[PDB]
């Protein structure tokens, strides 16, 4: 039924304006009762409320961003936005938009996936995917473990899947760690000794902020 | 504004056991005879989802082992019995008066049987060297507790630095954890050796699980 999706810039220079858009879908921002909210979650910290725009246009702002933001909306296109002027690192976070039945329930019942925004001057560099295949040792247990190394990209996030969704089990994707404005992340799949090298094991990384998308097949060393 | 304070700030509850998270408000979050405060849950990389609303009501889909109660200024979320799937952060919110405020969250990590890290290692992927570079990688998968430490080693010489560690969040289906480390050498440095190794030292066993490879 309803679906909310946050659209916005993956990276933004300090002291510049950030403006996100929430595209409500399969439901409209004018139906009575509901209010639409903006909520952000600074990385590694709690959820933080920002402001809301209710069906009849009424607006409310978190005091902390009140003097530096404006919440508008577009009835025609059925979507609402927010702008934060003069962003700073404190503004790096995950932003979500959601819905409240303001009239009866008062709790946020539908949330979008929430895009990520990183305030910085770093160059948005793509990633290189190197494939990790076992060091020549076969007859190794009855479950083999391979993985992909995604190195040197910016900004977060990157999305890696195996055999494009198919290999769901035994997959681990490790948080991107930082090496002076350049992330590195890894992922691994544990698949039984037969399905490799007999069958195809491929990892697909995708890095939106630079339209890079690359699958790599793990070939025996 | 009403400040919501949660307690504990984090806890390790064992499977089957019960966990009692609590949320207190500086001022009554009551009106029209009900308490307008709800409880959310947030698994990692996932927007929160409502668990309980208006203090005691359960959202559909949420299992019966969840149950909150409380009024005016004292609210409690109870999870009995905890299950592998409850490893996540929980928030409480008041929406009785403006601005709506959230609590800082309570990270629940739950306890399971201790498990040994299945380790694996990977030599540089051809491509990288071509690109004048070489990262060695060691995987320690599926363990509990989260504490474990790994030594690198090159031709015996314990490698102090150039190493990157990353831990996953507790697994929702089995409660384990996993980590990866990355030795990052230059092709050449990599060229001046023959054996590389990662020493997994962890509580499950006394002899550090070692994994090594000839260059």
């Amino acid at each position: 039924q309803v679906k909310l999706q946050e659209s916005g810039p993956a990276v933004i220079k300090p002291s510049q304006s950030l403006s996100l858009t929430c595209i409500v879908s399969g439901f409209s921002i004018t139906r009575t009762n509901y209010c639409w909210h903006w909520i952000r979650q600074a990385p590694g910290k709690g959820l933080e409320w920002m402001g809301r725009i209710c069906y009849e246009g009424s607006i409310y702002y978190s005091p902390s961003i009140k003097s530096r933001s404006t919440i508008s909306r577009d009835t025609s296109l059925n979507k609402f936005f927010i702008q934060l002027i003069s962003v700073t690192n404190e503004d790096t976070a995950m932003y979500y938009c959601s819905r409240e039945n303001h009239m009866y329930e008062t709790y946020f019942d539908v949330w979008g996936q929430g895009t990520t925004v990183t305030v910085s001057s770093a160059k948005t560099t793509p990633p290189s995917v190197y494939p990790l295949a076992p060091g020549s040792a076969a007859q190794t247990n009855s479950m083999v473990t391979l993985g992909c190394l995604v190195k040197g990209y910016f900004p977060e996030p990157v999305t890696v899947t195996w055999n494009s969704g198919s290999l769901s089990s035994g997959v681990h994707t490790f948080p991107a760690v930082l090496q002076s404005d350049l992330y590195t992340l890894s992922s691994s799949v544990t698949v039984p000794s037969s399905p490799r090298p007999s069958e195809t094991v491929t990892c697909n990384v995708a890095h939106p902020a630079s339209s890079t998308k690359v699958d790599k097949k793990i070939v025996p060393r | 504004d009403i400040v919501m304070t949660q307690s504990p700030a984090s806890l390790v509850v064992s499977l089957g056991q019960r966990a009692t998270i609590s949320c207190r408000a500086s001022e009554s979050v009551d009106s029209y005879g009900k308490s307008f405060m709800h409880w959310y849950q947030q698994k990692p990389g996932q927007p929160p989802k409502v668990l309980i609303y208006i203090a005691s009501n359960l959202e559909s889909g949420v299992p019966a082992r969840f149950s909150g109660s409380g009024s005016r200024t004292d609210f409690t979320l109870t999870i009995d019995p905890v299950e592998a799937d409850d490893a996540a952060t929980y928030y409480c919110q008041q929406n009785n008066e403006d601005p709506p405020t959230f609590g800082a969250g309570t990270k629940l990590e739950m306890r399971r049987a201790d498990a040994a890290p299945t380790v694996s290692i990977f030599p540089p992927s051809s491509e990288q060297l071509t690109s004048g570079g070489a990262s060695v990688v060691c995987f320690l998968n599926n363990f509990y507790p989260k504490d474990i430490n790994v030594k690198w080693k090159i031709d015996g010489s314990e490698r102090q630095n150039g190493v990157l560690n990353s831990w996953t969040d507790q697994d929702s289906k089995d409660s384990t954890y996993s980590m990866s480390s990355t030795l990052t050498l230059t092709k050449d440095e990599y060229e001046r050796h023959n054996s590389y190794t990662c020493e997994a030292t962890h509580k499950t066993s006394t002899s550090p699980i070692v994994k090594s490879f000839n260059r």
């Binding site: 209010c35 409310y60 009239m103 | 009106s31 029209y32 929406n95």
Partner: peptide
Amino acid sequence: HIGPGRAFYT
């Protein structure tokens, strides 16, 4: 003013 429906109370 508080409770639900508060934003559009007017």
